[PDB]
Amino acid sequence: TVPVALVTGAAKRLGRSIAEGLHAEGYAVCLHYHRSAAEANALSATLNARRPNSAITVQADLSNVATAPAPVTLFTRCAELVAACYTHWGRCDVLVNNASSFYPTPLLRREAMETATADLFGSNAIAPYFLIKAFAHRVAGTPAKHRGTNYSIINMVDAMTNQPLLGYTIYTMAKGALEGLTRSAALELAPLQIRVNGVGPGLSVLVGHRSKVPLYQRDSSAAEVSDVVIFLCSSKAKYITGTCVKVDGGYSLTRA
Amino acid sequence: TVPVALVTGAAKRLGRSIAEGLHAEGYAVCLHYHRSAAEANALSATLNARRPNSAITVQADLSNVATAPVSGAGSAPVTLFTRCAELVAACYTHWGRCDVLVNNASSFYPTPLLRNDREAMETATADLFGSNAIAPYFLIKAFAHRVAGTPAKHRGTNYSIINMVDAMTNQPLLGYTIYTMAKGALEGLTRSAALELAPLQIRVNGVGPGLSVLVGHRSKVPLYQRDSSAAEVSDVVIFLCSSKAKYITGTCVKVDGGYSLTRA
Amino acid sequence: VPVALVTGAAKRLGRSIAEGLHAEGYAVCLHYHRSAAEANALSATLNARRPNSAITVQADLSNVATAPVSGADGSAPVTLFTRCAELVAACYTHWGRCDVLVNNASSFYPTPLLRNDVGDREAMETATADLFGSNAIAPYFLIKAFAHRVAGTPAKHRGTNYSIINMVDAMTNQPLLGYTIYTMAKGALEGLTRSAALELAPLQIRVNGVGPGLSVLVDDMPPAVWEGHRSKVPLYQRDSSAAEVSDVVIFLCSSKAKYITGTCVKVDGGYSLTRA
Amino acid sequence: TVPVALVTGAAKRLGRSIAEGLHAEGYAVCLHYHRSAAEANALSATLNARRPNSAITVQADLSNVATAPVSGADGSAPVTLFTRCAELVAACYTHWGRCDVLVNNASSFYPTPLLRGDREAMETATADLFGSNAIAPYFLIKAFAHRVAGTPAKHRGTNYSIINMVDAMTNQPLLGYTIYTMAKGALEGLTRSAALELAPLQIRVNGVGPGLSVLVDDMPPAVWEGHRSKVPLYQRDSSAAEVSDVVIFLCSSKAKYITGTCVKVDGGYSLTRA
Ligand SMILES: NC(=O)c1ccc[n+]([C@@H]2O[C@H](COP(=O)([O-])OP(=O)(O)OC[C@H]3O[C@@H](n4cnc5c(N)ncnc54)[C@H](OP(=O)(O)O)[C@@H]3O)[C@@H](O)[C@H]2O)c1
Ligand SMILES: NC(=O)c1ccc[n+]([C@@H]2O[C@H](COP(=O)([O-])OP(=O)(O)OC[C@H]3O[C@@H](n4cnc5c(N)ncnc54)[C@H](OP(=O)(O)O)[C@@H]3O)[C@@H](O)[C@H]2O)c1
Ligand SMILES: NC(=O)c1ccc[n+]([C@@H]2O[C@H](COP(=O)([O-])OP(=O)(O)OC[C@H]3O[C@@H](n4cnc5c(N)ncnc54)[C@H](OP(=O)(O)O)[C@@H]3O)[C@@H](O)[C@H]2O)c1
Ligand SMILES: NC(=O)c1ccc[n+]([C@@H]2O[C@H](COP(=O)([O-])OP(=O)(O)OC[C@H]3O[C@@H](n4cnc5c(N)ncnc54)[C@H](OP(=O)(O)O)[C@@H]3O)[C@@H](O)[C@H]2O)c1
Ligand SMILES: Nc1ccc2nc(N)nc(N)c2c1
Ligand SMILES: Nc1ccc2nc(N)nc(N)c2c1
Ligand SMILES: Nc1ccc2nc(N)nc(N)c2c1
Ligand SMILES: Nc1ccc2nc(N)nc(N)c2c1
Ligand SMILES: Nc1ccc2nc(N)nc(N)c2c1
């Protein structure tokens, strides 16, 4: 049997690491991307080279916008992401909401503020919700007899959002939304044995505040975060749900 | 002169109580509403009867959608940001100031992840996230620009924003995911706005009811075994707005009779 | 006519709380350990403004047995629980009631996990007892005694606004380096706030916390380093005044707050929102 | 080559599972106990049978009281909690020359209501509940840290880890268990404080908080079923392993960027309301 994982924003950095980690545990991986076509396909080739038919790639804008062929809504695109797993492998056991846009929306000093709202809220919060819904329908729609035994959803949150980065309000709001989703989804999907957890990095794979991380005085490596994600997805973590785990080297414990 | 408060969803229940509470402390009140025209105007008449020119009513859909221009009809021109800016502007146009903002307006209804039609998900998403999170952000932006745009010598001395949050969102109501998500966003806004607006001395706080003015659920509340009254919530909002609370910012105050301390 | 007991009431925030409560019409039992002069001076002020509106009681709130006397000798020794029961009693003996309790008294000093990487079993066995006593254990026994006197009053002769306030700390999730026992104690105090709110709800006794960030900071340091510490608070770039904290305590004690219980209110100018 | 773990309250249930779990990853285990001598020595024999010299069992009251020093009617006398704690950690260094992991698992748990010669049960409840759950962990952590600091950087281990067994439900307190709840609150504080202070020594300090685990069935079957079914996930309390596997993961080098955090292992129980 092969378990299947869908990882959004899978092409580089943390998403890559999560994809690789899950693959190393024997998962077939659906690598989602938006712009990073080259890196996603390059990664898929690597995984497929180690293990045939263990990686595909699909493309999607997770921004809260309808596109063009009815233009196509964000819900439709999200449903089609999950479907891509079922079409290709007949299952989807793990979902990782990792894709996330991150840039300033200052309150102090209007078209590019239309699209900021749709992008930052789409990637970080709205799309995750629709992805979860699609994920949950597919599971519910499978007869109990042929359901998987380790359904897990991980939401990439942020360990530092209680201590907001100055000027990043929409982003912080979006992560707040995502934490809400983690709790709400965990509660509603418990009957289907679908676990919903969060993982929140502090500082990871940077390119300043490096020296202010108490443990090691450095940002983390990609693996230092993905290993937590992978652990939470393992059956060892089968009683954990609705919780967020900080992977931040004690950064959230600091003050100015 | 007279301090001015903008209160969204002001027509009934908690928003009305907040409006009344603020008015009782001497504030002029801009009462926002969406469809409760009758109850908003009725309230404005009451306040204006008690004190001339101390209340106006303004109408706005705070959903994350477009509305029509002049003599037209909807999904066209007027954005949520524009409508929000015009709400804050209405205070400055009428009274020349806006000292307090209360983000109270909020849609609340089920969005189940488990079925157990096509626009349903679109308009729920825009409404629940608009009222509860997006509009509050734009309202705060508009609020902040106006304060920033006033020359220092001419600014008020007690700028306060209150966000109606939810004391129970860490223990989510089954099937209310988008709503819970939206309140989560609102909490983030509270913290983020408090930090960014601190230099302008604008305070940003949350108030979170548990159960208030219910139309045994009550019997579950540890203290008194009842939902709260409107005043039991608005008095907290009003206190946080007072100058005695001038060192409080970026915090959420539960007003829940100890409901959040319970478990199944 | 309503009565308040305020521990550590002689100076600073405790003084402000006492004054604030007194200004709302409360009779105030001012508790002190070390500050006799400053407590009696305050009591005289309050009594001058309003006759019989202030008394002073002395007690070490450290988790130690302290024997029959402050001079003579022995019989059986006096536990912390006894001392705490006698504090609450002092209110009932003098005024026949105790409507509000404010656990404000608190010791605060370093207990480093590491040395450099003198000390004894004394400074150690007494730091634990003092920091945990003042901040957590005594509050628990105070609350017990408070709750027993309320429960023991026939429903007809009970007050209508019973309130307990626990002075917590807004910054304990971002611990001050080297202050572990103190932080642990505040952690314990937070727990007490939740647990007591739940258990005392049926008697309509509300239990809430107030947590300062930086308040009435002491300048036993260079002016620039004082300016240094002040300016990291986002709101106003200063520590708070005593009133800025006490007004919150007083509001939570008012009937206007009678649906709030089991919550902690930071009063910190957004300091808890910062990071290194 | 062999990493060493100290586990307090190791004799059964969760502590045993943690001990077994750590032993399965190759740790030598110092099993602590207070009252459960038989169970602790039985477990030690098991571990030692699977791998020689991979388990010892030390005895200690972690209550906040001073004990008497093996006696001899002479020699000052009062052994403080701090001393007993230092001697626990020392026992690892004496026997194996190291101590890489500490698990503060030992915990007394019983009612201290605020309503309704036993001054005796107020003093001793306070010392026991606060000792086991908070004070002793503090001294244990101190001893642990002093001993790492005292090692020349050259010989230090590379995966120092402290786990504190907390409680996922303490924000929603169990009626009548105030001291216990306060004690867990203290423990949470310790986790944060110790993480911050011990970061320079690369000692990680984390919490693991169960909701319901291996629920004692001393009630009507249906009362047990009732409580049981309050957990959203699976409608049951956890198994010991379902908790210890989390402890063991946090101790692994794959978790070496995690510090100062508490991980709920509660099947979503903390998400419920009355
Ligand atoms: N890096 C950190 O220190 C840090 C700190 C806290 C939290 N996190 C969280 O951890 C996760 C991963 O971190 P990261 O730094 O690796 O992320 P990242 O480098 O900033 O980007 C993640 C991916 O998100 C995708 N994405 C962004 N907007 C999208 C949109 N509108 N539609 C579809 N895809 C979109 C991008 O895909 P394409 O390139 O294919 O377009 C991008 O590769 C994120 O959720 C982040 O919020 C990271
Ligand atoms: N009631 C409770 O027990 C409870 C519990 C937790 C939190 N809260 C929070 O406390 C606040 C007030 O509670 P409540 O029960 O008084 O609220 P409510 O009765 O449900 O309604 C508040 C107002 O929000 C306005 N509104 C809703 N959607 C809108 C939209 N899309 N655009 C513009 N206005 C919109 C409505 O105005 P119109 O009628 O004029 O259209 C409504 O009167 C809310 O933020 C709520 O989330 C309440
Ligand atoms: N000041 C701040 O910025 C700050 C920050 C966070 C939290 N807080 C909290 O707010 C409360 C008041 O703050 P503060 O700065 O005004 O307090 P403070 O000046 O440090 O002292 C409070 C009082 O506690 C009493 N006290 C200390 N140990 C005692 C003991 N073992 N037994 C009996 N009484 C004892 C002392 O009374 P005597 O002088 O009579 O001996 C002292 O005057 C405290 O709970 C504190 O933890 C304050
Ligand atoms: N079980 C749960 O559902 C649950 C829920 C939440 C949190 N937890 C936490 O998880 C941990 C383990 O749970 P558990 O149920 O396995 O614990 P447990 O059965 O209640 O006992 C743990 C051990 O602690 C030791 N202990 C108690 N008081 C002591 C003292 N004063 N001095 C020295 N040792 C003492 C006992 O050792 P001896 O028998 O050798 O005397 C006991 O075996 C505890 O920290 C607990 O607080 C458990
Ligand atoms: N430091 C940093 C770099 C990139 C990031 N990307 C996303 N999506 N979110 C972050 N918080 C982030 C942080
Ligand atoms: N019980 C109840 C009734 C009405 C409500 N309205 C809003 N907007 N939000 C609520 N949480 C709510 C709750
Ligand atoms: N029981 C007893 C007998 C004699 C004592 N003498 C002093 N000085 N102090 C005591 N506590 C004492 C007690
Ligand atoms: N800065 C400061 C000064 C005095 C204090 N006293 C107590 N008791 N607690 C504090 N946190 C404190 C802080
Ligand atoms: N249910 C249960 C059983 C035993 C326990 N032991 C300790 N020490 N702590 C608990 N919370 C506990 C809970």
d(C-alpha C221, C-alpha C219), whole Å: 5
For residue A138, with 0-12 CB atoms within 10 Å meaning exposed, 13-18 middle and 19 or more buried, which class applies? middle
Which one-letter DSSP state was computed for residue C82?
H
Please check whether residue D260 touches A, CB under 8 A.
yes
Q: Is A143 exposed, middle or buried (0-12, 13-18, 19+ CB in 10 A)?
A: exposed
Q: Which atom of ligand 3 is nearest to the CA of C60?
A: 32
**Contact by Cβ (8 Å): D99, D161:** no
The residues pairing with D213 across neighbouring beta strands, listed in sequence order, are D238
Radius of gyration of chain B (CA): 18
Q: Name, in order, each residue with C-beta under 8 angstroms of A215's C-beta and a sequence gap of 6 or more.
A: A249, A250, D195, D199, D202, D204, D257, D259
Residue C157: phi and psi, rounded to 5, are -100, 30
β-pair partners for A247: A201
**C215 alpha carbon, closest ligand:** 3
* Euclidean distance between CA atoms C230 and C241, whole angstroms: 12
State how far the Cα of A67 lies from the Cα of D157, in Å rounded to an integer.
Answer: 55
The resolution of the experimental structure, rounded to one decimal in Å, is: 2.6
Tokens 């789409």 identify what position? Answer: A122
Which one of C140, C162, C182, C271 is the catalytic residue? Answer: C182
Specify the 3-state DSSP secondary structure of C267.
strand
Other C-beta atoms closer than 10 Å to the C-beta of C236 total 18
* Other beta carbons within 10 Å of A208: 7
Residue with tokens 């069935």: D217
Q: Taking phi first (over 0 means left), then psi (-120 to 50 degrees means alpha), and beta for anything else, what does residue A63 get? A: beta
In C, minimum Cα distance to A209 occurs at C276
Cβ–Cβ pairs < 8 A, chains A and B = 127
Chain D nearest-CA residue for B171: D271
What counts of helices (H) and strands (E) characterise chain B? 7, 7
* C192: number of Cβ within 10 Å: 30
Under 8 Å between Cβ of A192 and B113: no
d(CA B2, CA B10): 19
Q: Please answer whether residues B132 and B104 qualify as being in contact, where contact means their C-beta atoms are separated by less than 8 angstroms.
A: no
Extended strands (E) in chain B: 4-7, 28-33, 55-59, 100-103, 160-164, 203-209, 252-255
Structure tokens that stand for C47 in this block: 């009594």
Amino acid at A67: T
Pocket test for ligand 2, best of B39, B65, B108 (most atoms within 8 A of CB): B108
b/e D166-181 (16+ beta carbons within 10 angstroms → b): bbbbbbbbbebbbbbb
Residue C275 sits at the chain A interface (C-beta within 8 Å): yes
Which tokens go with D117? 């010669």
Residue A248: give its domain's CATH number. Answer: 3.40.50.720
DSSP H or E stretch at residue C102: strand C100-103
- Residue pair D211/D231 in contact (Cβ under 8 Å)? The answer is yes
Q: What is the DSSP letter of C133?
A: I
Contact between C240 and D154 under an 8 Å Cβ cutoff? The reply is no
Which protein residues touch ligand 3 with a CB less than 6 Å away? C 8, 10-14, 32-35, 60-62, 104-108, 130, 133-134, 167, 169, 212, 214-216
Q: What angle do CA D245, D251, D252 make, to 5 degrees?
A: 90
Contact by Cβ (8 Å): D52, D27: no
| Residues forming a β-bridge with B7 | B31, B102
HEC assignment per residue over A139-198: HHHCCHHHCCCCCEEEEECCCCCCCCCCCEHHHHHHHHHHHHHHHHHHHHHHHHCCEEEE
Measured distance CA(A68)–CA(C96) in Å, rounded: 77
CA-wise closest residue to A256 among C172, C235, C275, C273: C275
d(CA B62, CA B82): 11
User: After which residues does chain A show a gap where C to N exceeds 2.5 Å?
Assistant: 69, 109, 207
**Which amino acid is residue D212, in one-letter code?**
L
Output DSSP code: residue B225.
Answer: T
Query: Residue A168 catalytic?
Result: no
Can you give chain A as a three-state secondary structure string?
Answer: CCCEEEECCCCCHHHHHHHHHHHHCCCEEEEEECCCHHHHHHHHHHHHHHCCCCEEEEECCCCCCCCCCCCCCHHHHHHHHHHHHHHHHCCCCEEEECCCCCCCECCCCCCCCHHHHHHHHHHHHHHHHHHHHHHHHHHHHCCHHHCCCCCEEEEECCCCCCCCCCCEHHHHHHHHHHHHHHHHHHHHHHHHCCEEEEEEECCECCCCHHHHCCCCCCCECHHHHHHHHHHHHCHHHCCCCCCEEEECCCHHHCCC
| DSSP one-letter string for B41-69 | HHHHHHHHHHSTT-EEEEE---SSS-B--
Helix (H, G, I), strand (E, B) or coil at C210: strand
Q: Which single residue is written with the structure tokens 């969760």? A: D14
Q: Is the dihedral angle over the CA atoms C147, C152, C155, C160 positive or is it negative?
A: negative
Q: How far apart are CA A98 and CA A14, in angstroms?
A: 8
3-state secondary structure of C138: helix
Please answer whether residues D88 and D60 qualify as being in contact, where contact means their C-beta atoms are separated by less than 8 angstroms.
yes
Angle CA D216–D221–D224, to nearest 5 = 45
CB atoms within 10 A of CB B75: 8
The three-state (H, E, C) secondary structure of chain D, written as one string: CCCEEEECCCCCHHHHHHHHHHHHCCCEEEEEECCCHHHHHHHHHHHHHHCCCCEEEEECCCCCCCECCCCCCCCCCCECHHHHHHHHHHHHHHHHCCCCEEEECCCCCCCECCCCCCCHHHHHHHHHHHHHHHHHHHHHHHHHHHHHHCCCCCCCCCCEEEEEECCCCCCCCCCCEHHHHHHHHHHHHHHHHHHHHHHHHCEEEEEEEECCECCCCCCCHHHHHHHHCCCCCCCCCECHHHHHHHHHHHHCHHHCCCCCCEEEECCCHHHCCC
D45 touches chain A (CB under 8 A): no
Number of H helices and number of E strands within chain C? 8, 7
Question: What's the rounded Cα separation, in Å, for the pair B161 and D56?
Answer: 61
Separation CA B5–CA B240 (nearest Å): 13
Distance CA(C254)–CA(D41), nearest Å, equals: 58
Give the residues across from B254 on adjacent strands.
B208
Distance from CA of D95 to the nearest CA of B (A): 46
> Among residues A196, A24, D11, which one has the least CA distance to residue B113?
A196
Helix axes of B230-241 and B13-24: crossing angle, nearest 10 degrees: 50
Query: Which of D89, D92, D133 is closest to D110 using CA atoms?
Result: D133
Q: Which two tokens stand for residue D212?
A: 């319901």
Contact B163, B204 (CB under 8 A): yes
Token pair 């010892």 is found at D56
Report the interhelical angle of D178-198 vs C180-200 (nearest 10°): 150
Sequence-distant (≥ 6) Cβ neighbours of residue A243 within 8 angstroms = A182, A197, A198, D263, D264, D266
At residue C103, the 3 state secondary structure works out as strand
Task: Tell the residue number behind the tokens 């002073």, with chain if given.
Answer: C56
| Amino acid, single-letter form, for residue C51 | P
Nearest CA to ligand 9 atom 2: D215
Number of domains in chain D: 1
Sort strands B252-255 and B160-164 into parallel, antiparallel or unpaired: unpaired
Can you read off the two tokens belonging to residue B223?
A: 């203290």
Pocket of ligand 2 (CB under 6 A): B 9, 11-15, 33-36, 61-63, 104-108, 127, 130-131, 164, 166, 209, 211-213
The experimental technique used to determine this model is X-ray
C232: tokens are 């990291």
In the chain, the amino acid numbered A48 is N
Question: Helix, strand, coil proportions of chain C in percent (round to 5)?
Answer: 45, 15, 40
Gap between the Cα atoms of C11 and D32, Å rounded: 46
Q: Give the CA distances from residue D150 to residues B131, C117, D90, D159, D198, in Å, rounded to whole numbers and listed in that order.
A: 59, 8, 13, 16, 13
Q: Distance (Å, rounded) from C-alpha C99 to C-alpha C1?
A: 10
Are the C-beta atoms of A161 and A178 separated by less than 8 Å?
Answer: no
Cβ-based burial of D26 (10 A; exposed 0-12, middle 13-18, buried ≥19): exposed
- Please report how the helices C180-200 and D136-149 are oriented relative to each other, as an axis angle in degrees rounded to 10: 160
Residue D4 belongs to what domain range?
A: 1-274
Distance CA A197, CA C100 (A): 42
Taking CA–CA distances from B257, the nearest residue in chain C reads C259
The encoded tokens of residue C104 equal 């404000």
Distance, CA D37 to ligand 8 centroid (Å)? 44
Q: Is the Cβ of B171 closer than 8 Å to some Cβ of chain D?
A: yes
B264 vs D: CB within 8 A: yes
Q: What is the three-class DSSP state of C206?
A: strand
Those residues with Cβ within 8 angstroms of residue C7's Cβ, 6 or more apart along the chain or in another chain: C14, C31, C61, C87, C102, C103, C104, C105, C138, C142
Paired with D30 in beta bridges are: D6, D56
Which of ligand 6's atoms lies nearest the C-alpha of B166?
A: 11
CA distance D86 to D79: 11
CA distance A59 to A67: 13
Cβ neighbours around D82 below 10 Å, total? 21
- B17 close to B230: Cβ distance less than 8 angstroms: yes
Other Cβ atoms within 10 Å of C115 Cβ, number: 11
Give A149's contacts (C-beta < 8 A, 6+ positions apart): A235
